[PDB]
Amino acid sequence: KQVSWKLVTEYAMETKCDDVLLLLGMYLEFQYSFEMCLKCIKKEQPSHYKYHEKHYANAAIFADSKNQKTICQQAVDTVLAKKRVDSLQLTREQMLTNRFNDLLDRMDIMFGSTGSADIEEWMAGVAWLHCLLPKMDSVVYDFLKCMVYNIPKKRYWLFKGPIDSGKTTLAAALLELCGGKALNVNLPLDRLNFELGVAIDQFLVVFEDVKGTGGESRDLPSGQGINNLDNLRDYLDGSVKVNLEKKHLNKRTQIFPPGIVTMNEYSVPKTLQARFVKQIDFRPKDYLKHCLERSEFLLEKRIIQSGIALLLMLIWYRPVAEFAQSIQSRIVEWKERLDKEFSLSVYQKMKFNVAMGIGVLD
Amino acid sequence: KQVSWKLVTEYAMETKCDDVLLLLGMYLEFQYSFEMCLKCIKKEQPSHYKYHEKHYANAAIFADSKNQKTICQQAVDTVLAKKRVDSLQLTREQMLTNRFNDLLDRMDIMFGSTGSADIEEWMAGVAWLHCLLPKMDSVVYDFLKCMVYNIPKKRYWLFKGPIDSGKTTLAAALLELCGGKALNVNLPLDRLNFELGVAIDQFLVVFEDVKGTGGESRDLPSGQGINNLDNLRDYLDGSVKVNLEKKHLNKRTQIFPPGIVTMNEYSVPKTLQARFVKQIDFRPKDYLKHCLERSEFLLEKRIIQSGIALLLMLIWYRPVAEFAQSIQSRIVEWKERLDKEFSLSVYQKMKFNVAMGIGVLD
Amino acid sequence: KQVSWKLVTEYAMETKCDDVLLLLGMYLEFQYSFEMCLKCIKKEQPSHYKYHEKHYANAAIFADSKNQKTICQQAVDTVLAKKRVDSLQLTREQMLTNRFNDLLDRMDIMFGSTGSADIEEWMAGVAWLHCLLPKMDSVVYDFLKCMVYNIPKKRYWLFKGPIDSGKTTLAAALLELCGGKALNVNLPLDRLNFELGVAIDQFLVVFEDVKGTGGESRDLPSGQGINNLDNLRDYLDGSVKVNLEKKHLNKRTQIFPPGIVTMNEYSVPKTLQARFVKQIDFRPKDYLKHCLERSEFLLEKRIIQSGIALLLMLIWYRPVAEFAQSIQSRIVEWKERLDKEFSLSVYQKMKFNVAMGIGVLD
Amino acid sequence: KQVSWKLVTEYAMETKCDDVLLLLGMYLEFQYSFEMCLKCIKKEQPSHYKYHEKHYANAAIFADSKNQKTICQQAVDTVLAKKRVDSLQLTREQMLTNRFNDLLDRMDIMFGSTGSADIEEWMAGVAWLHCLLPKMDSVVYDFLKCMVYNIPKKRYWLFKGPIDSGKTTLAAALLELCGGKALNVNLPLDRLNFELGVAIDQFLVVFEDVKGTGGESRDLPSGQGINNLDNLRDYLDGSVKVNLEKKHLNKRTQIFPPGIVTMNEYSVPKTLQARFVKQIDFRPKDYLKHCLERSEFLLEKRIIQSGIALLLMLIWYRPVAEFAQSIQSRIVEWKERLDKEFSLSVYQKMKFNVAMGIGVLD
Amino acid sequence: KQVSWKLVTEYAMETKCDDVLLLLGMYLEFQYSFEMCLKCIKKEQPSHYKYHEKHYANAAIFADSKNQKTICQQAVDTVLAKKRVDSLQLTREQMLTNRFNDLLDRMDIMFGSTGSADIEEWMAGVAWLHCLLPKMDSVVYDFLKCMVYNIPKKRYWLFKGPIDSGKTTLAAALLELCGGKALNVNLPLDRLNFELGVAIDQFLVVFEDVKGTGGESRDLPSGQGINNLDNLRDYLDGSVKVNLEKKHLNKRTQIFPPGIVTMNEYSVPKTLQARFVKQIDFRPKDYLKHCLERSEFLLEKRIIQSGIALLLMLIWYRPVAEFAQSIQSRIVEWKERLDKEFSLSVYQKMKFNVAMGIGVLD
DNA sequence: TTTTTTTT
Numbered sequence A, B, C, D, E: 001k002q003v004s005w006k007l008v009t010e011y012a013m014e015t016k017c018d019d020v021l022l023l024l025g026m027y028l029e030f031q032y033s034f035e036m037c038l039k040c041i042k043k044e045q046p047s048h049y050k051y052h053e054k055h056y057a058n059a060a061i062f063a064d065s066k067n068q069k070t071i072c073q074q075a076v077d078t079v080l081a082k083k084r085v086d087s088l089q090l091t092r093e094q095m096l097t098n099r100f101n102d103l104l105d106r107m108d109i110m111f112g113s114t115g116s117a118d119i120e121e122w123m124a125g126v127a128w129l130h131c132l133l134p135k136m137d138s139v140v141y142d143f144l145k146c147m148v149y150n151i152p153k154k155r156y157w158l159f160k161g162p163i164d165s166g167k168t169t170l171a172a173a174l175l176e177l178c179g180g181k182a183l184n185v186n187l188p189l190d191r192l193n194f195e196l197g198v199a200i201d202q203f204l205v206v207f208e209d210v211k212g213t214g215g216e217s218r219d220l221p222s223g224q225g226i227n228n229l230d231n232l233r234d235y236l237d238g239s240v241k242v243n244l245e246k247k248h249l250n251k252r253t254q255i256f257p258p259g260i261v262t263m264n265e266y267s268v269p270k271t272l273q274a275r276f277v278k279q280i281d282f283r284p285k286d287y288l289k290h291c292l293e294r295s296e297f298l299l300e301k302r303i304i305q306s307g308i309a310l311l312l313m314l315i316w317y318r319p320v321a322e323f324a325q326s327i328q329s330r331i332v333e334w335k336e337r338l339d340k341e342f343s344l345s346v347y348q349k350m351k352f353n354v355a356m357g358i359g360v361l362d
Numbered sequence F: 001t002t003t004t005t006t007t008t
């Protein structure tokens, strides 16, 4: 009796798996008796224990197959095709709406009955971020609109401030929220070709702390980052489709996605300054160090640098109407949970703790 | 029973889909019962909702196949082969009349019963564009003619001027009209070969804001595109059918397309200066800026970037007889629709507001 | 009758082999009779003698196969797929627990009846290592925790001091204790792309002997490793997923691992100094040298380089509670075995000899 | 029944089609009933209507094939192999035969229905050139035979003349007529090796003018090209095969092609002078330049830079017997055309205007 | 009837061939009638004449196969697989023992009844080599043990002395005896990367003729050799692994081999001096020069270059117990042959003749 | 074949 390639394809689709080796490895686990499957019994990974019983019979036949890599390749191609279809047909707002549903599904696990992390430590992170900048949640909402609208040559925000000002942290949290990638531009112009190939078919890019020049006056070690970017004015502008690499693969032509750039304070030529729409300034604050020095669980669990914390911040602060119409129900549900789990006075206490630079909890 | 590769290819031809993943993805959507297909019901995408009912049976059998990518390969190659054969056997006029028919087909939908575009917003775009330079439509006709005639060493026009002067904006609309390609050559000489590969079988090309030299006198940092163009002068002359390249494929002898260049004001070498039909200056004009600042929905919807605005402009400004012959029926049909929609007062009231710097729709 | 590919995949899994040639070459040995197999009878090599008699009949049929490399390719893929799955799903603690289990398995062999090693020689090395720094075992525990926790920015330790202060000796031991590989970044900037590719999916990294510049005053030969490092600033921070490259392969995206930097007494930019948690300051000492001269069986058997030596140190000094819970069973048996062999007086006698600069043994 | 691979290959040979996508594209068109075929009915392309009826039955079966691209690949190989075989049998006269037979077919466009500049203007260019210097038609036939005979040392002619002597304009027409390539030699020797390799396997070359070593003694730019050339002794002579050097590729070796040199009027060494077969000698003349200033459409059409004007000139002046035996059959036809087009008195009146300095077409 | 792939693989294993083309061509020769085979009858190559009779039948079927290169690939894979198994599993003593067996086999041919060599001339070779240094046979035995033990730090030997004082002669014979490859470090650092790639999987390396700097004080050409070496202190001391790279290959990681460094009288930094176990002085001795001048068959047959001569020297001088236990039987057999064919007095006479600087033989 | 190497 033969393998159902259809069952494999369905698993890959349902998992959103898009690496042939992950798919291969994952599917093989299901060859063993699901009844005794310790991973199921431990409820260890949902992408396993939800599926093992259903896929078990087909995995036993797959384990004998001579074709295995070919079956997995087709399944991965089906997932990749779905992404391309979506990218060409969804509005950007639907893309974000889908991305939000996925994060909310994780939150249903994180704070589920399994309760693998506690909502107090997570909510504590929100207060720390809210203190990081003035009017923080307003700044986040502006950024989301900007990325969704994707207005030509109004597409990039510049983060500037000293070392350890917090700019990388905020970028990292935003990048998780929207989904996207970081790219290193402090590199030679040749291999840079394939670096940009990474950006194919994605929502955001982040360029990290690109080195400028002449800042060694202030001991900013100089480098090609700024020179490199100014070759790519068109990529930022987003007025024209551009052609993107991959190894052993032909060009893809598409608009280069919007994003943000982080900078210790080298100088900027005005060709490039003209292309940022908004610069934000970041500053060291010792009481914030002191808070972290006590509340080190924030860093160990990477709470403050994670997009989940930004979503929780938005849920706490924004009217339900500001969310895309479909998810508004799930937002109401989480607003209710949060209002139930915390008084405002508790949140005010946490903010005061952060302000005092004591550990967030007392 | 067995997949009809014939029916697959027929859909590929009819959508003009020419990507193997895009084709693969979309055809798989047809495997479900079209009678409940929410996309059909909701009339979301014509590339789906027209074809689903027809292709359904074959798509179910396709969904079972083990050959899927290979089927899509042969289908795509038929689409590309049509393009190549058509590329040789048609006159540039016939090419352009095909392109215009395609855009007219979109417009028939965009202002159709779905009608999601306001004609008057779109016409406000036309006003802004014809306001950008005198006799805008007339210079557009001169450009179109020059590209149809495609005369050796009279095949390129230069746009030169400072940032935010609109040169990029105009190139976008022309390129969206003509169906060409952008290329970037601010790059290491040896690497450009596959970038030039994109020029295979294109009506037109555009080079964006190429890096020159000596402009750092004025904060324009130097780069190689200037020298690259000098070496590429062979293609710019377009005397002979150069053998263009693409990965894992045979190379392709053809005449290099004509095109446009945009420039912030670096030096020009005499040899490059020698090669143009024409130069055009571009000049920041604050009253337009003040208008857009109110009227920003124009730019949000990219109206002023989009060739559909130019086509509406030429329908408005130009004689029916100025168009190529066979389309002149559709020209009249659309001329009538504009004539039905507008008083000249409405247009003039708008163009007044544009000249002032008011919200165009006051 | 036909090859069982399943038996080959089992052998690959059981040996954890991931070279197609090594797998092939070993599997082919099983085709002769195990009953006369002199390697079995000499019981020379465990990856052979455990398995020959099981695999025998399938090896004989495999010897006749026309497909041999395809069979091995599928088997090696399964072992590679297993690693990929684990690299997503295991905790860093659980990885380290696995790594320990395998070293402990080699320790069971080395000190077995096969008796390739003298535990007294190996314990001598622990005395030399524990003498090299204050509170040596505490330093190892703090480092291991740091690598398990992987706290952003707080990820890297800097080793510096004169040449011949044992810094690379110590780095080697840690690197063998964990998983990982070394890297040399004094390179030209372009080849660096493939240098960093080595880090993919690994646990530790060690940057080896980074040349600074300006050290020529201290007679240090000079180079660009430090300036290269300050370009890789985000790789140290580990705050966001970077892109990594191998020859003929698409870029992987992942967090760059934590690790150690070794150098002589150059200076370091603030941007890079800010990225080290801890700076260990090694010193030349004569008694270590004069002891080691009279103790050269240490170097001749590579004892003080090797991870097995550090593991013996931890088993001696650290409480059973400090190990991950599942290995505490094996740890207790090894603790018993050690004390059954060595009195404290014997160990202190060894440390006394080292402190005296006498040959460790007496 | 089944696709005849035989018939597909016949068409590829008969059309000399040597691109797999074109072959695929065109052959697919035959699948419709030729009896109705509108392309046949309108005689639009011979490459179609010559063949459709014969190939139709095979094309119907071809359209159902699942191997289609593979059939076309084998067919294209056959055509490429034919070129490969013949490339090793070409006499230089047989080579020349084709290289003009090609241009006669191109000229079936030049004054076909395309007719894109006046056959009058084209002969007016011929008029203007024929009175630059003596007997120009004979001079072409002589230079032509020189390049076909390729007699060692007896292979190179020199254009000596000041700035604006026309030698560059002439050189344009020469390479245009004949093929070959232009080259520089004023590089530093350090560079020049690769530049010399560029000539590899061209039938002919031009050298762009040496900037005289000490040439500015004449008020003409100084440079290195003199000593560079006379150091390149043997390349000129073609006595023996020489090594040649492509960038990024290994050596090749070949008899160095014959050709042409341009010079402004520098201090040619006796040795360097002795290399040449024939100086030709050029200076400003007033009827010429003032006629240009009155015939400027010829420069705008660059006809006076045109080798096609030279081919036209030979077609006019020279005996039929001077052309190779069979290709002669075409030249009479263009003469017949040109004679029906023009009396002598026309070409006379044109020539008179040039001699008078009058605008040639007056 | 079928081809036996097994018989081909046996021949490949038997001949140790690992080039597919060399394997292919040789097997095809067996298809002609062994019963008349001229190559057999001339006894030209053992690799042919030993096997033709055996493989004749299979080669006849092989000659008709359509799969020929596919068969050879699997065969060559088997030989490469054998090498990689051996590469990991053998001891360094086992490796050398195998190497010795190979030379002993070649000697059995060279001096056989078919033997084209002269055992007396090769014995004259041993006399000249034994004269080149003090204690020569004791010195060789010391060098070998050093390579077999591969003790870190204690790994490398330095040769120095004038030009034409024999150093590379000895290096070449040692390199032939052990196997290994020579390296050139007198480079800029960029190419040095692929240079070291040669060392992968070698038993020995020789650093030929390292240029110091400042030897120009005494007319030695200055260069970057020594300066490049002292970067690589880890590579010599061999305590820890290094990364190694070849063109088009992913990096490997291993202990860098032991080896020899050679120079004229350049100055040596003490940093480098401490790297070496031993330094051997060579001095030009005129009686050797006059002996070669009268004993030219030594040079012309390359006798004194050959590792076979050093092997003969070991066989003649060393006690049987010094060889690896397995080969001691062959050593006894060769010692018997040599003691039979040469008296001690005769060998001593040759040694006396070399001391006289007269020709070796009388 | 591309890529990597070459090239700078």
Ligand SMILES: Nc1ncnc2c1ncn2[C@@H]1O[C@H](COP(=O)(O)OP(=O)(O)OP(=O)(O)O)[C@@H](O)[C@H]1O
Pocket: A161, A162, A163, A164, A165, A166, A167, A168, A169, A170, A209, A262, A263, A264, A282, A283, A284, A285, A286, A288, A289, A292, C152, C153
């Ligand atoms: N505003 C702040 N005040 C004090 N400490 C801060 C602040 N922001 C960040 N930190 C500390 O700095 C560390 C690094 O933050 P982050 O990487 O976001 O800064 P950055 O300015 O982007 O730095 P860099 O340019 O070096 O990447 C944080 O983990 C936290 O410990």
Ligand SMILES: Nc1ncnc2c1ncn2[C@@H]1O[C@H](COP(=O)(O)OP(=O)(O)OP(=O)(O)O)[C@@H](O)[C@H]1O
Pocket: A152, A153, A233, A237, A239, A274, B161, B162, B163, B164, B165, B166, B167, B168, B169, B170, B209, B262, B263, B264, B282, B283, B284, B285, B286, B288, B289, B292
């Ligand atoms: N003539 C103009 N006057 C004022 N604003 C202008 C003008 N043209 C363009 N703009 C503004 O400049 C923005 C960018 O226009 P565009 O990219 O076409 O200019 P550009 O001259 O090509 O610039 P750059 O050289 O920086 O790419 C537009 O979105 C619009 O907001």
Ligand SMILES: Nc1ncnc2c1ncn2[C@@H]1O[C@H](COP(=O)(O)OP(=O)(O)OP(=O)(O)O)[C@@H](O)[C@H]1O
Pocket: C162, C163, C164, C165, C166, C167, C168, C169, C170, C209, C262, C263, C264, C283, C284, C285, C286, C288, C289, C292, C299, E233, E234
């Ligand atoms: N603290 C010490 N005092 C004196 N000698 C030492 C000390 N530590 C190591 N040694 C000696 O130094 C030798 C080399 O050690 P190692 O290679 O680790 O030195 P290193 O200074 O860390 O080297 P590098 O800087 O080149 O990596 C050891 O084999 C030992 O002989």
Ligand SMILES: Nc1ncnc2c1ncn2[C@@H]1O[C@H](COP(=O)(O)OP(=O)(O)OP(=O)(O)O)[C@@H](O)[C@H]1O
Pocket: D132, D161, D162, D163, D164, D165, D166, D167, D168, D169, D170, D209, D264, D283, D284, D285, D286, D288, D289
């Ligand atoms: N025979 C001629 N008589 C007068 N003017 C001439 C003649 N030939 C060319 N010209 C003038 O010379 C100008 C440049 O022509 P061309 O480049 O062909 O000359 P050249 O001698 O090769 O020049 P250069 O050495 O400067 O490159 C033409 O545009 C024309 O004005």
Ligand SMILES: Nc1ncnc2c1ncn2[C@@H]1O[C@H](COP(=O)(O)OP(=O)(O)OP(=O)(O)O)[C@@H](O)[C@H]1O
Pocket: E132, E161, E162, E163, E164, E165, E166, E167, E168, E169, E170, E209, E283, E284, E285, E286, E288, E289, E292
């Ligand atoms: N000890 C010696 N006394 C005299 N002549 C010698 C001696 N050794 C070598 N020769 C002569 O020197 C020639 C070259 O020897 P060899 O190539 O080994 O020299 P080298 O000094 O090691 O060279 P290099 O350093 O250039 O590689 C030999 O062929 C022989 O003629």
